[PDB]
Every structure is written in structure tokens, then in C-alpha cells.
């Protein structure tokens, strides 16, 4: 039964932790200054959907981060028999505990985020609702089955279970990606800029279940510290430049993307 | 103290707990692989839409079932003065619990089944977006005040107070299907379909407060892995067999239900 | 270690926080009778979605505050070093306990019934779905905040930290009402109506984060009673009345939001 405190205090005392944190809560609070500068020459309701779905993203990412880093969702959980960190221990306060430091906070984030990371480019390539309402509710299956799997200390194989089960749902958000919105955007006009977005998200998304299998929640060839950073430099890149990217080149196209 | 791996051992060392989980993820995965494969050849948005929220009910059943049979989901409960399961135990562990395996999970996958099947249902009957809103948040309201209620460990009399306010969200949703879709669908030209799922729907519906009143939550007539069957098998019609039955009517009929969304 | 029955025994034996909250609870029970009486003779779709959006308003209300009520959505929370209300203790289930009776069940209230009044005043307005979009995000995103502050028992300054945030999402809200659906409704022939409804939201509104920082979850001149009544208070009026006087213009200008 730690204490919030303690789990606050063992971040700030871990080099990797403490930075995976605090640099991405930095680079939130610089994104949502650089995007509200950014877009102020938009007009257009439509165009500014767009943009507030995507300013979201580091509104979420900040606020998230910011759990984390006050040791409100972060957990220390006791790994099942056969897992690769059960075994594992952490000084906490003036005691050995038995667990993983666990910062399931990751996956508000990323339940919070990627709807907003689907909206903003469902909208870009034109989709219609159906579609924008498949890849979505999917997405949050993805995540929420993810954190279950995260959260699992009962036995070993059902982490695994929930992870398949949200390979499953990460499979209909890439056909989705990379079939349907493909070719919606060239009825929108927006093909160009979306096979990039679409690239950039695709290979970034794909980063996550890989890292989650090598990492501590899987069989932990990565330490906490390190999975830590591993999922916080895909953050970077998969929400703030991402959403800096698409921003480019919106605030240059208001009218492709209007009506 | 009760820890997750204890209630995982005791679900799977209790003959009615076990196979009521699991025997429903099984159902779920089948009739999500059955339901893909009936669906391909929809083209419609419209038609699509009514087809992915059906979809998604196994989907949300399949992984909320696992909530419960990991352990995820599951809390031991005291029940308060008065109670008629107040002071049970449990053997947990080996040790003795005071306490009642609570499946407070249960409520987690009809909170996210419920609204796909009102959207749905509501497609079907050609609704307006003020029903399809009033349907569903007053929906909602009733799983998670049922969830309260279950939760409540307080009073005895407080636990009741939730389940009459729950049924008071239930009454809006049984109009609504009853009153107002019934209505919409003859002048969508799904009328006799949409008796029949609205029917089916409102019987299998009823069934759920009069289990919880009989069960371990309410009155305990049912002990707990009795609960758990009665529930399990209420989902098994309520969900996949009349999600397979409305794709069938939407694969032989794309064309009625084409349109707009 | 406290129970629930515990804190629902504490709430009921203390003149100040039974009335605080189950004072609420018979209101709501009443506004939704009230307003379901109000609003029988509907009949446009629009004018109807804006009647259940605000009738959701004490559904949310008598369900949010039984929480409350019963100990379900309460916590006894040990403040930080440095947190005016550090050291605190209480005295529940007949013995002294370290820290403050937490009623976080309030954000739930809040979180659950404001975007019910957003969509609703946005309506009335004649907005666009765009800043509709804006002013529900940002408004949950507010409230969830405002509970993490509620919640952080890591260090005081944290605590005052999402207190911020919850702030700058709460001016995109500010800028939102006052200024962009002042605009929007004037054409939607609401502008009278928008005006005073306007007026008594962002004056109500203004209160959440000064009844904050004044209570005991801010530098606690106001005890656990007094925060309860000074939470308990811009409810009543920015819920109940701004639902009643909101259904009261919708029960005579049926014919003007319904559009065509
Ligand atoms: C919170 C609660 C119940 C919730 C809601 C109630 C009662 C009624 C809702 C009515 C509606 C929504 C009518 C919709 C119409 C529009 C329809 C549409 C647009 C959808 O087509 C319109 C024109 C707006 O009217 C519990 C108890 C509430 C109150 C009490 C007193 C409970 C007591 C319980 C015990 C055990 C004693
Ligand atoms: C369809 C869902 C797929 C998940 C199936 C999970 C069932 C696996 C149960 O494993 C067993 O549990 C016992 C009790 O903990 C251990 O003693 C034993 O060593 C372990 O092998
Ligand atoms: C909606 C169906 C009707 C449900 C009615 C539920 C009544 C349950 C009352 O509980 C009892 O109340 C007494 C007085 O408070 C306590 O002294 C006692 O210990 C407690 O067990
Ligand atoms: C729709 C389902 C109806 C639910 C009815 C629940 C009634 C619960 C009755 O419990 C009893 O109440 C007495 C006081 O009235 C207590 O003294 C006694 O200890 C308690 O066991
Ligand atoms: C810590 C969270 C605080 C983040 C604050 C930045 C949110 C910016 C939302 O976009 C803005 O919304 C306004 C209202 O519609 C528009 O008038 C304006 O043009 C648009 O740029
Ligand atoms: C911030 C943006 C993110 C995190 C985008 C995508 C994330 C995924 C595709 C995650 C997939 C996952 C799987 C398939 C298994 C469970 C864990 C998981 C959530 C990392
Ligand atoms: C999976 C589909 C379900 C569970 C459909 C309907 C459920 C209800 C109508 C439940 C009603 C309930 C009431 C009226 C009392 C509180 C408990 C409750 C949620 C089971
Ligand atoms: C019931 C209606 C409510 C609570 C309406 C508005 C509430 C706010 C504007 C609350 C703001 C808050 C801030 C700015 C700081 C954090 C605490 C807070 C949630 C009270």
C-alpha cells in the first residue's frame, strides 16, 4: 500500500522516469503556445474542427502527463507467476515492495489522444460518419483492452489474451488508416498530405504493441526507465510533430479542407 | 487484500461462476466471426453503421466477460444490516472473507452494450436524433446507478434507493422503444422487423431487474453463481442471438435501411 | 481503512453536511418532476432535445449527490506538507483518522451535468456543431482536472498546479459563452434569452474556482460543512434555477428554436 507521495518521489528520483515525464510535459505545454500561434489565421468551421480536435492532443498529453508525474495513475502491481518481472522489487518510502512501478496513466493518455488523432484526420480525408465512428470506437477498444492487459496481475496467459484482443482492434483502426481514409482523401483533395500523416501514424502506431512485448508489461527485455522512454519518445513524434505536421498544412490549405 | 489472482482461482474452482464467464467469451468470439462473415457484402453507410454498432456488442462482450474472468472486475463486498446475504463468506486464499464475490463488471459490459444496441435499434426504426439521445443517455444513467447500487455497501436501504431510480431511467428507455420507435418504424418501412426486435428486446430487458431483485444483490434467493447463470444467459438472447437475427434481416435488406445517418 | 458506512454515517450526523447534500438530492428529485410537467406539450424535435439535455441536468444531479450521500464517491484524503488543512483529522467509525473528508463525488456531478448545459445553452444560441465541439472538451477537461487536484495528496503544489491547468481550459470555455454565442444567438432570436442565462452561468460558474481555493481543498478558511455549502450553493442556482428559468423560455418560444 504505497503512498502517492512515495510513488511522486521515486520519479523524481529516477533519471529516466524523472525526464521521460517532465520533457514530454514540457513539449505539451510548447505545442498547445505553437498551435494556438499557429492557427489563428483560420476561419473557416470546418477548417477549426480540425484544428481543435488536433490542439486537443497535447491538452490531453499535458493533463495526462501531469497524472503520472503527481503519482496519481501510477500503480506498483505484482507481476503473475511465470511473467518475466514477477520477482521484481522497488524501494518505496523506507521499504522494499514487492512489484513493477506500473504507469497505467499511459493508457488515458493514449485513450484520450487517439480519438482526437482519428477525428482530425478522419475529417481531413473527407470520411464519412460510419467510418469515422468504426475507427474510433475500435481505437478505444484498442486502449482500454491494452490498459486491462496492463492491469492484469492474475495470471500470465490472460495478460496475453487482452493483448491479442487488442491486436484484433488495432487491426480494423489500420484498414481503416490505410484502405478506407486512403481513398476518401483523394475525393477530398487531401491525398498527398495524407499518405504522409498516414505513414508517420501507421509506423508510429505499429511502435506500440511491439514496445509493449519487449517492455516490462511484456517479457522485459526493456527496464522500466527504458520502456518508459521508448513509449515517451513515440509520443513525441506520433502526437506533438504529428500534430505539428498536420497544422503545417493546414494553416496554408484553409480553403481545400472548408465548406 | 483480496487480491485479483484469488478471485481468478475461485472462478475457475466454481463450476457455475467458470462456465458462466467463459462459456461467454466463447459466444462472443463465434458471433463476431459469424457476424463478419454474414456482413460483407454491405456496401450502404447507413446500412454499414447499423451493421458496425451490432457488431461492436459482442465485441464489448467478449472483453468485459474477460474483465470478469481475470479477476479485473470482480470485488469482494460486505453486505450492510439487514441485507439477506449480509455476513456470508467466501474462502479465498484458503482463508475465510466476510463478503460476497461481486461481478461488478457485469455492469461495465451492459453500460457498452445497451447504447449499440439502442443505436441500432434505433437506425432500424428510423429515429430522430432527440429519441436516438434521450434513449441512450437515459440508458447509460440506468447501468451505472445500477452499478451504484451494487456498489453500495453503506446500507441496506440506500441499495434499493438506486435500483428505483435505475428503473426510472429503465421506464424512458421502454417508452421510447415501446411508444416512440414502434411508430417510426412503420413509417420507415422496418415496422415488422422492428416488432420483433423491440419485442424480444423488451422481454429479455425486464428479466434483468428481476434477477438482480432475486439475486445476491437484491434478496439472494439466488446465491451467487446462480446469479451469474441467470445473467449470463439473459446476455446469450439478448445479445448474440438477437444481434444475429437483426443481421439477418440487414443482409437480405440493404436496401430499406439505405440512407443518410 | 474507513468504510463506507462509515462516511455515509458521518455526512448523516452532521447538520451541516446531511443538509448540504441530501437538501440537493429532494430538489432535483423535485426539478425533474417539475420539469417534466413544464415541458409535456413539446412538440418540435429541436425544442426537445433541449428539454431532455436540461431534464438530464437533475437526473445527473439526484444520481451524482447519492453518490455522495452514501459514502460510494467520498474519500479520506491526508493533505500535504505545507496544504493549510495538513495534519488534519477527523473522527470516523468512532476513531480519530488522519486527513479530510473528501467529497470528490462532486466532480463527478460536474463533469456529467456541464456538457449537458453547454449543449443546451449552445443550442439555444444557434452554434455550430464546431464550438459546441470546443466548449464540451474543454469544459469536461476542466472538470477532470479540477478533480485531479481534488485528488493529489503528493504535494501541495501539484495540487494548485492542476488547479492552473484547470483554469486554461476553463477561459477557452469563458471566451466561448460570453463571446461567441453572444454573437451566434443574437441571429438565432435568442439573444434576450442567451443574455441572462449567460449572465447567471459565468457568474456561477466564476465561483467553482474561488469556492476552491477558499475551501479545504484550497487554503481551507471554509471547513469540510462550509465547502459542502459553498459547492452545494452554485449548484442550486447554476443547475436548478438555470435549468428552470432556461425551460421556462423554452416552454414559451417552442416555435423560435425549432428553426423551421
Ligand atoms: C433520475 C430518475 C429518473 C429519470 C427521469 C424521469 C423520472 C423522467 C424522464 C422523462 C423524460 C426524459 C421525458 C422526455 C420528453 C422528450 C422525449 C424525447 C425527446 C426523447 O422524444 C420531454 C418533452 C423532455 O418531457 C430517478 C428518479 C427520480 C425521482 C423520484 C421522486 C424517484 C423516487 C424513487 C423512489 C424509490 C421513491
Ligand atoms: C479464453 C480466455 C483465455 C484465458 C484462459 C486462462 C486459463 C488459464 C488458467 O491457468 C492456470 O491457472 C491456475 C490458477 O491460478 C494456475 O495454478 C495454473 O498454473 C495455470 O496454468
Ligand atoms: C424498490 C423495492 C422496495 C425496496 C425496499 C427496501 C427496504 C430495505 C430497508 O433496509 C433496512 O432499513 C432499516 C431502517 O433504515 C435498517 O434498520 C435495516 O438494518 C435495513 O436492513
Ligand atoms: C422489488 C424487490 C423488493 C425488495 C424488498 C426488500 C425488503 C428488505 C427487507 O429486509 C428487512 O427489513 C427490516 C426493516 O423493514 C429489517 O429490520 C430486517 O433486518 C431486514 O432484513
Ligand atoms: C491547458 C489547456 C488550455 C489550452 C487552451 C488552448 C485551446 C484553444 C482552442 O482553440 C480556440 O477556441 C476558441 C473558441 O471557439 C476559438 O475562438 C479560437 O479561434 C480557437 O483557436
Ligand atoms: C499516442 C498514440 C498512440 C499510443 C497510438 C497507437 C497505439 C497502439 C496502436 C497501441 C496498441 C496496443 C496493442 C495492439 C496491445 C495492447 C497494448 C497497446 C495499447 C500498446
Ligand atoms: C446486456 C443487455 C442488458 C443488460 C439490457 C438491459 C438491462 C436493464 C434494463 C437493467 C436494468 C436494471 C434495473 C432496472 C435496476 C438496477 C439494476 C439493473 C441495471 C440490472
Ligand atoms: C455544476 C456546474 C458547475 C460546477 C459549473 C462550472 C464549474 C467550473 C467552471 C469549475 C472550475 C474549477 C476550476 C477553474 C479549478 C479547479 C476546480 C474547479 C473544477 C472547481
Redesign the interface.
Known amino acids: 500500500e504505497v503512498?502517492?507521495?512515495e510513488?511522486?518521489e521515486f520519479v523524481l528520483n529516477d533519471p529516466l522516469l524523472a525526464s521521460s515525464l517532465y520533457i514530454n510535459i514540457a513539449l505539451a505545454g510548447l505545442s498547445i503556445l505553437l498551435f494556438v500561434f499557429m492557427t489563428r489565421g483560420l476561419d473557416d468551421?470546418?477548417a477549426?474542427?480540425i484544428a481543435?480536435?488536433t490542439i486537443?492532443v497535447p491538452?490531453?498529453s499535458?493533463?495526462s502527463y501531469?497524472?503520472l508525474?503527481?503519482?496519481?495513475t501510477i500503480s506498483v502491481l505484482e507481476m503473475?507467476a511465470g511473467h518475466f518481472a514477477e520477482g521484481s522489487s522497488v524501494m518505496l518510502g523506507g521499504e522494499e515492495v514487492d512489484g513493477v512501478v506500473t504507469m497505467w496513466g499511459r493508457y488515458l493518455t493514449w485513450a484520450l489522444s487517439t480519438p482526437m488523432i482519428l477525428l482530425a484526420l478522419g475529417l481531413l480525408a473527407g470520411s464519412?460518419?460510419?467510418k469515422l465512428?468504426?475507427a474510433i470506437?475500435?481505437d478505444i477498444?484498442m486502449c482500454?483492452?491494452g490498459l486491462?492487459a496492463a492491469?492484469?496481475?492474475?495470471?500470465h496467459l490472460?495478460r496475453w489474451?487482452?493483448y491479442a484482443?487488442s491486436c484484433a482492434?488495432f487491426i480494423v483502426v489500420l484498414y481503416i488508416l490505410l484502405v478506407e481514409w486512403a481513398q476518401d482523401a483523394k475525393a477530398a483533395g487531401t491525398a498527398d498530405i495524407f499518405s504522409t500523416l498516414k505513414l508517420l501514424t501507421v509506423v508510429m502506431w505499429l511502435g506500440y504493441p511491439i514496445v509493449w512485448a519487449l517492455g516490462v508489461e511484456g517479457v522485459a527485455v526493456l527496464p522500466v526507465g527504458y520502456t518508459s522512454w521508448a513509449y515517451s519518445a513515440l509520443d513525441i513524434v506520433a502526437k506533438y510533430i504529428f500534430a505539428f505536421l498536420l497544422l503545417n498544412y493546414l494553416t496554408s490549405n484553409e480553403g481545400v479542407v472548408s465548406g
Open positions: 503512498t502517492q507521495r510513488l511522486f468551421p470546418r477549426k474542427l481543435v480536435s486537443l491538452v490531453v499535458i493533463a501531469t497524472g508525474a503527481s503519482g496519481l503473475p464519412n460518419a460510419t465512428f468504426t470506437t475500435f477498444a482500454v483492452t486491462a492491469l492484469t496481475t492474475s495470471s490472460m489474451f487482452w484482443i482492434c
